[PDB]
Design a protein around this ligand. Structure first.
Ligand SMILES: *[C@@H]1O[C@H](CO)[C@@H](O[C@@H]2O[C@H](CO)[C@@H](O[C@@H]3O[C@H](CO[C@H]4O[C@H](CO)[C@@H](O)[C@H](O[C@H]5O[C@H](CO)[C@@H](O)[C@H](O)[C@@H]5O[C@H]5O[C@H](CO)[C@@H](O)[C@H](O)[C@@H]5O)[C@@H]4O)[C@@H](O)[C@H](O[C@H]4O[C@H](CO)[C@@H](O)[C@H](O)[C@@H]4O[C@H]4O[C@H](CO)[C@@H](O)[C@H](O)[C@@H]4O)[C@@H]3O)[C@H](O)[C@H]2NC(C)=O)[C@H](O)[C@H]1NC(C)=O
Ligand SMILES: CC(=O)Nc1ccc(C(=O)CCc2ccc(C(F)(F)F)cc2)cc1N
Ligand SMILES: [Ca+2]
Ligand SMILES: [Cl-]
Ligand code: NA
Ligand SMILES: [Zn+2]
Length: 803
């Protein structure tokens, strides 16, 4: 119940929420059906529209008007935004030349430059270029401020998951808004775009920017706007708040436009109908900037123009139906559309089986436009698994397509949609920052929206709540207020074992034909085991181990490794392959060769008998024997300390990567440095497992089975310089491949590896930072580069999309 008989007089768009049943006048009272009786009359005036005209100039103040053109409007803070242009001969902001804002130029009583976040729904990245002719205000923000060619949203590329990621710096799996529709089995409650349940605070995790601000004494405008409040009124409200007394005035504000998304769904992303929505959003930007100029704030405020996600061409006829795959379609609930989430229709049905659902959905039709995954098998870059609201069964839908349960669900009302994989070009969205704290006429590389919360905190002088951004990775966007992080302290120092064991101390069940027999070369081989080639193969320093563990550094001619005595295998293996390097075979006499490592105790080694006895599990090597520098050095590659457990199906992937692709990358990139290793993430939280979280071992042994294998592949950004003699910035690409016992993910896997392996690897592209989380390692500790530049490098994702 709401006693709507109270009044909004002098309360329009009040910032503090008054508690039920007293009636509300805040900018979300509509959504709660709780506005006071006179809210429309008082707070949503429209009389005479939104623009001053010549005849209105110097008018007698009529309180009924939507905005004012009387002499008193400036001191009242309620002029129409074009008042100074029409009535006082001023220019529109957009018509002014841009002039660098070197320092904030703020009115007296302003403690800090305010931040205004101008958010646009469905604003695809390419609209910035493609629509530039009809968006002069936005184009000026873009050209004169700091801009990225695009900003990567989070998956699923839907509205609420992205706006809330922008507000919190968190992945959806951590903030809890994992889709526009959700079921939470613990609450036994459903969240929907339309309705009231979504306003319940229990859905919304983390700490959004307005709460961060408020807790730290920085006042916030109320970010959410009811759909029925026109954009002109949203802008006027912001400008009015900006005229409050110092002690009452917010420092952070948000605007939201439901365009161009609204029209994009109807007309497609480049529908001819799309020009008008773009013109109209630009007009709204113009109104804000004119309004700031009137208030003398246009060289004081930091403005962020940011989108949630893009828009793709999608029509009803491009729908896959689960009824064409599953016998038992009525026993499942599907969350449909540009992604699929499947769970049992009834928890009482004990004939429900995820394994049979997955199999019935796997590579069943030749042109199949979705792929099923258990959520833990989704690309780790999506970070889309560690939440009870995410169903175990996920369908990744091809761009341009929908999935639905049955044809009757689809009945064409639409031409655009979004939600697809966040690396898809059509899903990319926009970022521009303009103001004293942003750089002038600066283009920055694409970056992820999870990074922005940190920066918004920087812009406001706030300490960010713990989040998934990498603070300092976006320092290059900023003129001042940079955050100068220090590298994390190494927690575990390595041991550097020498030769401590005789061959006969080992009883590993391994054999090698290596007893094939010199003071010239013997001193030189001793040098290699002591680290004399380490500077060639470990180019950016040893990775730091950021947790408590026991491990050894092992040096070799061709590779260096950090060998874990706890996990019985390397945490990392580092090696450099020059452009000139030659690939060779594993010699016939060495096919099954495994060699005890006389630096490492039998008790801390793997054994070959475990692999013999495990009929599902084989092994591979982290440093590839194919890339040995010489016949003699090749023996090092067969050390038991370079061995890792691999399913035969996975070995197909790994062997092709090592035998074919590493060389190809070294040819293309002018040498590469490779760091490879295992990852254990059995609880799919994106974080390194402890020893007691491992669910699978090589049968009979304490050898833990990796859930994934990573590689970080680094070279010189200036590829005229070889990877091992690089003077400047680095270039990186990485992957986190799932360690799976089948290649069911790759529908073309019965073909030669040249037709499917690299495609798999591309899907599983990763940031170095993703690998850091998954391993507790910190990379690039010793470069000639600034730490902020290295943080940016660590957040880079190589996407393989066209331009
Ligand atoms: C992205 O960045 C984020 C933010 O930094 C990272 O997330 C953090 O990761 C930490 C490790 O997973 C995690 O720390 C745990 O916190 C537990 C207390 O959590 C509450 O308090 C915080 C602080 O205010 C709050 O933010 C939390 O909010 C979560 O839960 C509510 C629902 O109640 C949601 O509204 C919200 O969205 C969020 O959910 C998300 O996280 C939870 C896990 O916390 C998931 O379950 C969800 O799926 C969702 O993703 C909470 O309200 C604390 O209890 C934990 O302590 C256990 O483990 C430590 C190990 O040090 C040990 O000392 C203790 O013994 C303890 O174990 C006991 O409980 C076990 C579980 O029941 C039990 O098995 C044991 O036997 C013990 O009894 C732990 O410290 C931190 O909460 C989150 N923070 C957030 C905001 O998500 C994230 O890792 C980053 N991602 C990547 C890829 O880097
Ligand atoms: C069905 C429905 O309610 N759709 C809506 C969805 C969103 C909104 C908003 O007003 C969002 C405001 C906002 C701006 C910026 C951010 C930031 F900073 F994080 F980027 C976060 C939030 C309003 C409506 N009406
Ligand atoms: Ca884990
Ligand atoms: Cl959804
Ligand atoms: Na296959
Ligand atoms: Zn939409």
């Amino acid at each position: 119940w709401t006693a709507t008989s109270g009044s909004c007089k002098g309360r329009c768009f009040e910032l503090q929420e008054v508690g039920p049943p007293d009636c509300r006048c805040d900018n979300l009272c509509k959504s709660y059906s709780s506005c006071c009786h006179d809210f429309d009359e008082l707070c949503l005036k429209t009389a005479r529209g939104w623009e001053c005209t010549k005849d209105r100039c110097g008018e007698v103040r009529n309180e009924e008007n939507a905005c004012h053109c009387s002499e008193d409007c400036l001191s009242r803070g309620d002029c129409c935004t074009n008042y100074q242009v029409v009535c006082k001969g001023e220019s529109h902001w957009v018509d002014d030349d841009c002039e660098e804002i070197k320092v904030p130029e703020c009115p007296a009583g302003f403690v800090r430059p305010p931040l205004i976040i101008f958010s646009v729904d469905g604003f695809r990245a390419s609209y910035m270029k493609k629509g530039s002719k009809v968006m002069p205000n936005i184009e000026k923000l873009r050209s004169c401020g700091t801009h990225a060619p695009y900003m990567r949203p989070v998956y699923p590329t839907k509205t609420f998951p992205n706006l809330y990621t922008l507000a919190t710096g968190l992945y959806p799996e951590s903030h809890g808004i994992v889709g526009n529709s959700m079921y939470d089995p613990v609450f036994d409650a459903s969240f929907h775009l339309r309705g009231r349940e979504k306003f319940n605070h229990r859905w919304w995790g983390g700490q959004p920017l307005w709460i961060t601000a408020t807790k730290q004494g920085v006042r916030a405008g109320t970010f959410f706007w009811s759909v029925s409040i026109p954009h002109e009124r949203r802008i006027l409200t912001i400008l009015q708040w900006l005229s409050l007394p110092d002690n009452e005035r917010p420092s952070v504000y948000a605007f939201y436009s439901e365009q161009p998304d609204f029209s994009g769904h109807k007309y497609g992303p480049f529908g001819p109908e799309m020009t008008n929505p773009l013109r109209e959003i630009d007009k709204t930007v113009g109104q804000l900037m004119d309004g700031l100029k009137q208030l003398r704030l246009h060289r004081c405020v930091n403005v962020i123009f940011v989108g949630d996600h893009g828009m793709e061409d999608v029509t009803c006829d491009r729908t896959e139906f689960l009824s064409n795959y599953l016998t038992n379609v009525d026993d499942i609930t599907l969350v449909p559309g540009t992604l699929g989430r499947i769970r049992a229709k009834s928890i009482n049905n004990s004939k429900y089986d995820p394994k049979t659902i997955i199999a019935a959905l796997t590579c069943k039709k030749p042109d199949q436009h979705f792929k099923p995954y258990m959520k833990q098998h989704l690309p780790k870059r999506l970070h889309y698994a560690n939440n009870r609201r995410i169903e175990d069964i996920h369908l990744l839908v091809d761009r341009r397509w929908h999935v639905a349960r049955k044809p009757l669900d689809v009945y064409c009302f639409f031409q655009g949609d979004h939600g697809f994989d966040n690396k898809v070009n059509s899903m990319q969205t926009v970022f521009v920052g303009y103001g004293p704290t942003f750089k002038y006429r600066t283009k920055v590389p694409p970056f992820e929206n999870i990074e922005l919360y940190n920066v918004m905190c920087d812009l406001l002088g706030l300490k960010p709540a713990p989040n998934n951004g990498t603070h300092g990775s976006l320092n290059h966007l900023l003129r001042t207020n940079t955050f100068r992080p220090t590298m994390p302290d190494e927690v575990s120092r390595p041991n550097y074992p020498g030769i401590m064991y005789l061959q006969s101390e080992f009883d590993l069940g391994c054999t090698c034909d290596d007893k094939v027999e010199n003071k010239l070369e013997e001193l030189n081989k001793r040098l290699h085991t002591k680290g004399s080639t380490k500077e060639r193969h470990l180019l950016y320093g040893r990775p730091a181990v950021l947790y408590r563990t026991s491990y050894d550094i092992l040096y070799h001619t061709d590779f260096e490794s950090g060998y874990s005595e706890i996990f019985l295998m390397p945490l990392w293996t580092s090696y450099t392959i020059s452009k000139q390097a030659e690939v060779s075979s594993i010699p016939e006499h060495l096919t099954n060769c495994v060699r005890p490592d006389v630096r490492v105790s039998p008790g801390f080694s793997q054994n070959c008998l475990a692999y013999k006895n495990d009929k599902q599990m084989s092994y591979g090597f982290l440093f590839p024997p194919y890339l040995s520098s010489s016949p003699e050095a090749k023996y090092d590659a067969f050390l038991v300390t370079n061995m890792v457990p691999m399913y035969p199906a996975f070995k197909r992937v790994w062997a092709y990567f090592q035998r074919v692709l590493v060389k190809k990358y070294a040819s293309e990139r002018n040498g590469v440095n490779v760091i490879s290793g295992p990852i254990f993430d059995y609880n799919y939280d994106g974080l390194r497992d402890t020893e007691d979280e491992i669910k699978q071992y090589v049968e009979g042994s304490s050898i833990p089975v990796p859930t994934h294998y990573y590689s970080i592949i680094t070279s010189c950004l200036d590829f005229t310089q070889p990877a091992d003699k690089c003077d400047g910035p680095l270039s990186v690409s990485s992957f986190i491949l799932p360690h799976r016992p089948d290649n069911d993910e790759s529908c073309n896997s019965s073909e030669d590896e040249s037709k499917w392996v690299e495609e798999l690897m591309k899907m599983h592209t990763a940031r170095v930072r993703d690998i850091e989380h998954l391993t507790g390692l910190d990379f690039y500790r010793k470069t000639s580069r600034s730490y902020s530049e290295i943080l940016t490098l660590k957040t880079y994702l190589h996407t393989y999309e066209s331009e």
